[PDB]
Ligand SMILES: OC[C@H]1O[C@@H](O[C@@H]2[C@H](O)[C@H](O[C@@H]3[C@H](O)[C@H](O)O[C@H](CO)[C@H]3O)O[C@H](CO)[C@H]2O)[C@@H](O)[C@@H](O)[C@@H]1O
């Protein structure tokens with residue numbers, strides 16, 4: 001089947017362009033939605049950094065004029081981009097490999113531009129869209145509504161959220177001297193374009209860890225946590241009725257019943273939720289993966305010392321206390337109504353509300369993606 005895609009600028013003045021980029025269902029061929037409603041399946045270019053040969057910028061009707069409504073074909077790994085004023089320069093690399101705007105890299109053609117995107121996937125099973133602040137918040141927050149079986153709505157960042165986030169993070173940086181302010185991205189004019197999560201600022205330095213921003217943010221805290229659980233159990237409720245597993249630190253290995261082992265994490269690990277003890281590994285049993293998720297989340301939320309049993313029994317009010325925490329997540333959460341701010345933010349105490357920015361429907365009829373308010 002196909003879904004109807006509605007692109008809408010609710011209030012921003014002037015012209016906003018949307019791009020819809022994805023991997024075609026089955027073929028895996030990068031596809032872009034075109035302004036005319038057709039799909040542009042690029043061929044592999046003759047060189048890297050080959051400008052997208054077709055203009056796939058979809059011009060949005062003016063603020064309030066209603067949506068651009070096209071047919072959304074099924075595609076995965078898909079994005080709806082929005083960009084204000086300008087268009088976005090997409091390139092092609094041999095493959096074809098779409099060169100997506102790199103929100104976090106300053107050399108990027110689009111870096112100085114005001115642009116955002118949300119991720120979605122539309123396959124025969126469901127349209128699954130995701131508002132997510134794991135990586136960045138921008139000056140062009142996206143909201144969505146998915147109409148199918150049910151109506152699902154994800155509230156955007158409110159107007160001005162990215163400025164608030166940038167200011168809070170700069171304030172944080174003033175207090176702790178950590179590079180939170182460097183997560184902020186602004187053009188020559190002064191307006192905040194985006195703020196990126198620490199991992200996106202840290203990954204350029206992954207090859208040179210001794211210069212990585214934030215590298216020692218969590219180091220002291222991690223040592224305190226590892227020391228705590230040398231002498232007392234860490235109980236992680238796997239939830240879903242799977243029960244808790246009790247863990248202890250032996251040397252630098254946090255070991256849970258079931259022999260699930262977690263080496264001592266680094267600030268990098270906590271931020272990426274994907275290195276050190278939080279490195280994904282298909283060999284990991286479900287229990288290990290559940291443990292992994294909850295331990296990463298608990299470190300990000302800085303509840304490892306305060307809550308030897310988690311996530312059940314903790315609440316959001318326990319998160320992000322003290323000087324050393326994932327202030328990106330704290331600040332994003334402060335400044336956003338819904339949506340995750342770090343990779344294991346989906347870890348939530350039972351009975352706490354789902355705060356994912358996800359919208360999914362098994363029979364999507366219209367996927368309204370909007371900027372403005
Ligand atoms: O948000 C910034 C990050 O975007 C990343 O890209 C994501 C990612 O590629 C994602 O893949 C999903 C799953 O990992 C898996 O491939 O299956 C689902 C179903 O298709 C995928 O959606 O796809 C989204 C687009 O929906 C895409 O944005 C990376 O490029 C990161 O480098 C980047 O920080």
Ligand SMILES: OC[C@H]1O[C@@H](O[C@@H]2[C@H](O)[C@H](O[C@@H]3[C@H](O)[C@H](O)O[C@H](CO)[C@H]3O)O[C@H](CO)[C@H]2O)[C@@H](O)[C@@H](O)[C@@H]1O
Pocket residue numbers: 076077078119120121123125126128129130132133134135
């Ligand atoms: O949030 C930023 C991060 O985006 C990530 O990718 C997400 C995610 O993987 C998601 O998967 C979907 C569901 O989990 C679902 O069960 O299955 C559907 C397919 O039917 C999946 O779509 O999908 C969203 C949107 O496609 C996707 O962005 C990561 O890839 C990270 O790299 C990134 O930081």
